[PDB]
Amino acid sequence: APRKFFVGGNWKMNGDKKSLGELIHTLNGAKLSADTEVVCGAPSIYLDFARQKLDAKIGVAAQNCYKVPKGAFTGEISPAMIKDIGAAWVILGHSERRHVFGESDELIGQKVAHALAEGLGVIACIGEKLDEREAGITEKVVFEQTKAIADNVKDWSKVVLAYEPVWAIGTGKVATPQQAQEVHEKLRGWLKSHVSDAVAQSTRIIYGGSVTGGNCKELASQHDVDGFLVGGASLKPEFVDIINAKH
Template sequence: MGRQFFVGGNFKANGTKQSVSSIIDNLNKSNLPSEVEVVICPPSLYLDLAVHENKQKTVSIGAQNVFNKSCGAFTGEICAEQLLDLNINWTLTGHSERRTIIKESDEFIAEKTKYALDKGLSVILCIGETLDERKQNITLDVCARQLDAVSKIIKDWSKIVVAYEPVWAIGTGLAATPDDAEETHKGIRDHLRKTIGEDQAEKIRILYGGSVNGKNAKDFKDKANVDGFLVGGASLKPEFVDIIKSRL
């Protein structure tokens, strides 16, 4: 398989200067495995702080959001050039909370993803179904639609990591079983084989996100198509280190 294990931490709109510093200090003091790539995404207010306080070579700082245009008259938005100015090389796009609450469309998310890539950022592209869509048994149809919006305008996926996050499992304490996640991830990879080619589909990392914690992370260890995790609430806690070490 040969895909590097990847753990992302999405702090969402949580934290203070003190707590973000404390989280990073804990990571700095931890003996993290050198073979695991880690990206943490604090609120935008604390991105510069995180960059300066992070001392771990395997940990990078990412943004939670980016706009689809260059800097200009876009009140409240963050442009890729500003992230790069802060030495930030990663961003999330397509998180379900922006899809469902902010009502960002598949096409808008694809445009943001392309713009970020064109400017030199790497992207964690989030996809996933709602509970209603899961009940309708259209999980893979939803994921395919969200991915297809991106593949229509992006050919090179080498700097994209896909994060499958079932909306019904985010922040609820519910999680897909390892077998469910593996089945969905395999379906996602099979779809990507048809749209972006065998080589790119085999190389791309597909993360699972949805109430992952220090206890259940090891349960996914032997799943061939689960290449890591995008972690929400647990990334704010010391157990985040246990998730990073869950493949040891």
């Protein structure tokens, strides 16, 4: 019945071996709630190193992958490679991929289908831009993004949806608890009606966008917020407090 609370840290394009080493030591030595599923998204060049150093209860995620196992795609990595080094998750459809690197809903869907077929878990990101929210079409936008993912998902047990409003990512402008709840509730209703009641009730829908130690507890108390995707604060000691937001 109860969805396990989920906190992912997305380190983005940050770190070197020595500074990530220090972060990993802090996380390994910290008291992390046993009721939180924790996943760290490391830059591709440090995925191996991170999986080797992190305690086994912390999952490792890649920050992107491509949509076939192998081939003539200079610069890309595939789900087979991610699994080879022992990572169990991949983040797909991140806002930075969609808006800086031009990844379309079609390509993201194809990535989701492929990562799931290869046995990875997927954190699939959706979210509206500021102009979209101000025009009052948030629902339309997130439903459309969600549909593009859902059309490529057979088994939902390994999917986490991350609602991250683009205007809240890296800016410090966090969504209010009520803004986040309204969207998660609607998304969960979308799952009920377009997939099944059982998938709606078991799928984690996490919030991301300027989550800090200072604001996480009120966010986490909302009934449809199942955890967080944390960027900037995942590089700080306060990541520990976010993992422990329900305690």
